[PDB]
Structure 1
Amino acid sequence: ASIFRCRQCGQTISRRDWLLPMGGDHEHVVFNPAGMIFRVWCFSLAQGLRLIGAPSGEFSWFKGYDWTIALCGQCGSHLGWHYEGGSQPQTFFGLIKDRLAEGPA
């Protein structure tokens, strides 16, 4: 089965069935302009989230997709981002592995 929760509150965010092989792997190692290296896991579906701010294509790690920040809908923890703007798929979620916790139903 297997699902992914907000590590700060237990909120259910997504699950393994929903991983999306972007580029060929669901996991991307990236860094940002702050010099922080995350591991980002890509889902085609997520629930339990609140999106914040405007879509933005600056700094995007993924070609043709703008991002908006995704917060845990329950606790406000920054779980990662929602991506929109592209084709096959149009939108998807890029979530910071470290901020989730993977366990069972």
Structure 2
Amino acid sequence: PGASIFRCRQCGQTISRRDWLLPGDHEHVVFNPAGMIFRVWCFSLAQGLRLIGAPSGEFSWFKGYDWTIALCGQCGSHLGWHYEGGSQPQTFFGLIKDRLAEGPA
């Protein structure tokens, strides 16, 4: 379509694909302890990120998963989190939908 690739909204960095969305919903609405609301889309796969630090289970929105902050590898924009250490699946990405731009391949 014109809606197959997700890029960083701020710089255009290639991040993910609609094909790589992971449900039983791809969309999750969550709050951090600073009360910031995020509309998170779960992806099986993403690229062009920089994962910062080591995983933490603190305040994890997803039972059994530890998170690392995922920046845009290009521009440093906070795009979401990489989740690991869980089961079925072991890992995935939670990306902030409004920080991405959807478009053609």
Is TM (by shorter chain) over 0.5? yes
Q: How many residues align?
A: 103
Per-residue CA deviations over 1:57-102 (Å, capped at 9, x if unaligned) read: 0010000000000011111111000000111110100000111111
Following superposition, the deviation at residue 104 of structure 1 comes to 1.4
| Alpha-carbon distance in 2 for matches of 1:33, 1:87 | 25
Does 1:61 pair with 2:61? yes
| Alpha-carbon distance in 2 for matches of 1:55, 1:34 | 19
| Alpha-carbon distance in 2 for matches of 1:74, 1:34 | 26
Following superposition, the deviation at residue 103 of structure 1 comes to 1.3
Following superposition, the deviation at residue 48 of structure 1 comes to 0.6
Following superposition, the deviation at residue 54 of structure 1 comes to 1.6
Q: Which runs of 5+ in 2 are unaligned?
A: none
Per-residue CA deviations over 1:32-64 (Å, capped at 9, x if unaligned) read: 111111100000000011100120000100000
| Alpha-carbon distance in 2 for matches of 1:81, 1:92 | 9
| Alpha-carbon distance in 1 for matches of 2:56, 2:94 | 14
Q: Which runs of 5+ in 1 are unaligned?
A: none
The counterpart of 1:13, out of the listed 7, 12, 15, is 15
Any idea what SS the aligned residue of 2:62 has? Answer: coil
TM-score, scaled to structure 1 = 0.95
Any idea what SS the aligned residue of 2:19 has? Answer: helix
Any idea what SS the aligned residue of 1:47 has? Answer: coil
Any idea what SS the aligned residue of 1:38 has? Answer: strand
Percent identical among aligned pairs is 100
